[PDB]
């Protein structure tokens, strides 16, 4: 009726504010431990080992020793 401002819906705003405050809900559960162990440590390590091997495979393809890293 009056105004360009959106007419707020209480449930939509509750949903949004719940999204903005997720860190208050973290519990070190079993599922969270597994998800952080798999995606926060293991997968980055696997990707790093892949990238390094790629360079080493290039190194041995060129008749050169393995390049040291890190």
């Amino acid at each position: 009726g009056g105004g360009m401002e959106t007419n707020k819906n209480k449930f939509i705003e509750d949903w949004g504010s719940a999204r903005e405050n997720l860190e208050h809900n973290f519990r070190w559960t079993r599922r969270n431990f597994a998800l952080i162990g798999i995606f926060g440590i293991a997968l980055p390590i696997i990707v790093y080992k892949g990238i390094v091997k790629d360079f080493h495979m290039q190194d041995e393809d060129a008749g050169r020793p393995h390049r040291k890293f890190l």
């Binding site: 360009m4 959106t6 990707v47 790093y48 790629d54 890293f69």
Partner: protein, 494 residues
């Protein structure tokens, strides 16, 4: 040694322009709103034209620094500081000078309540950032970068929309200051060897492989916070969302570029052996950032949060490019930096157009806007395409050149980085279709206004620049090749 340059238009006057504007505005009553608006706008526009002139007198054949001029701090002359640019920093000066008037124009309607403090803060930011991009000295690079924290803090805290701006500003300041202190530590370790902080000399000193490892880590700790690289990226969504529209434009378009500029300007040429040793590490961090942050972007429900997360994926692609250490890689990294500075700024401007009218960032409230705001819808679609790296747009040039550079070094990293083509499309098109397509929802929004003349004019130069870099990037690449080539070769003699 006085290194005064022959050129009439030089760097010091371009530094002085917004300073003089700020001093003049200090003394004009807040009742004279029209005078304040015009003075700030004109100072910013004159600075932009000055930077354009600096582009014309630029010499694209030398690997040296240009317009080099000097700046003398003590009569003992032990410590004397230099300014100069090259083909890696020139376009960033131009981008800063171009974006600042846009920021003054975005807040034109609300200037009666914004006051002269808004314009003064943005002018001071402009002066500090141009200084930062123009410094041939580690220690002054440090001093001028930390200085921007104060006006940025004020900009976020005062003119942010809601009370979350408090936490956002605290986090921005503290993260950035922590990184800055790390790089101060690095600067002092360098000084203990060399007795100087002059960039030109450090480019001609030899660091031990060991001393290089430690110095590289200490530089990385600043720069990775600046880029941002995971996992120190979480300050960025909060800060870039809670800031006012022009504040978000400056944060995404300029301040984010400072970490990649620091990588290009000090870390890669000063410590080439460490740069080589850390390359797998950088590749891994950037690839993880691109995939994970793109997937997080997919599940965001706030307009500004979607645009802000997108910038993390783009900057980590930039890092992959620059650490590829070839012509395609570094050229693409610089081109993508500039293109992102245009595209993300335009996207923040689109979201700001929506927020100024409707005062919500939640995607669910919008929808069907094509039928009430077709001009905004068309412009928003164009910048959405640019954010997906659509060929013909400026971002595609940098994106593909970076993929070229990465593929020649490591095919796996290029393969992980090319996944961004799929994920960025997904979130960009989903955002656009949820905002613009569909039906209206009159129970949330029933009153609408398309863009006024000021908003259309604001968008025009962004469109022109995006298309211009997209179809004919030769104007930019021709001025950069000598500098990029000398950066790539530095440290080797075969």
């Amino acid at each position: 040694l006085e290194h005064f340059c022959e050129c009439y238009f030089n760097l010091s006057g371009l530094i002085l322009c917004p300073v003089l504007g700020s001093i003049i505005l200090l003394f004009i009553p807040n009742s004279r709103i029209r005078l304040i608006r015009l003075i700030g706008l004109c100072a910013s526009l004159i600075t932009f034209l000055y930077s354009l002139v600096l582009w014309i007198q630029f010499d694209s054949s030398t690997a040296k620094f240009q317009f080099v001029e000097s700046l003398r701090w003590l009569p003992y002359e032990n410590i004397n500081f230099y300014l100069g640019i090259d083909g890696i920093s020139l376009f960033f000066v131009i981008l800063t000078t171009f974006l600042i008037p846009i920021c003054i124009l975005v807040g034109w309607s609300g200037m009666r309540s914004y006051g002269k403090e808004y314009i003064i803060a943005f002018l001071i930011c402009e002066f500090l950032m141009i200084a930062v991009f123009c410094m041939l000295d580690l220690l002054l690079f440090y001093v001028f970068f930390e200085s921007v924290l104060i006006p940025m803090f004020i900009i976020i805290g005062v003119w942010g929309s809601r009370q979350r701006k408090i936490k956002a500003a605290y986090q921005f300041f503290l993260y950035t200051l922590l990184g800055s202190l790390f790089m101060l530590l690095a600067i002092l370790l360098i000084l203990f060897q060399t007795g100087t902080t002059d960039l030109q000399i450090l480019l001609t000193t030899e660091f031990s492989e060991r001393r290089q490892i430690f110095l590289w880590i200490a530089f990385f700790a600043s720069f990775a916070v600046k880029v941002p690289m995971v996992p120190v990226h979480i300050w960025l969504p909060e800060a870039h969302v809670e800031a006012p529209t022009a504040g978000s434009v400056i944060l995404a378009g300029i301040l984010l570029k400072f970490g990649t500029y620091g990588f290009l300007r000090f870390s890669i040429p000063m410590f080439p052996e460490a740069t080589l040793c850390f390359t797998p590490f950088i590749y891994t961090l950037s690839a993880i950032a691109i995939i994970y942050t793109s997937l997080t972007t997919l599940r965001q429900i706030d307009l500004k949060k979607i645009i802000a997360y997108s910038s993390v994926a783009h900057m980590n692609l930039v890092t992959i490019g620059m650490f590829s250490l070839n012509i395609q890689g570094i050229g693409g990294s610089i081109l993508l930096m500039l293109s992102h500075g245009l595209v993300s700024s335009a996207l923040f401007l689109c979201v700001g157009v929506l927020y100024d009218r409707h005062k919500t960032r939640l995607v669910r409230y919008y929808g069907g806007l094509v039928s009430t705001m077709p001009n905004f819808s068309t412009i928003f679609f164009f910048f959405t395409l640019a954010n997906m790296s659509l060929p013909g747009t400026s971002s595609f040039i940098g994106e593909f050149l970076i993929l070229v550079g990465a593929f020649q070094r490591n095919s796996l990293v290029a393969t992980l980085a090319a996944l961004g083509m799929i994920l960025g499309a997904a979130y960009s098109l989903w955002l656009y279709n949820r905002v613009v397509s569909g039906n209206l929802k009159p129970d949330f929004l029933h009153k609408f206004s398309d863009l006024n003349g000021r908003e259309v004019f604001i968008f025009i130069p962004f469109l022109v620049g995006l298309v211009w870099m997209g179809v004919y990037p030769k104007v930019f690449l021709d001025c950069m090749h000598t500098s990029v080539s000398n950066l790539v070769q530095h440290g080797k003699f075969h």
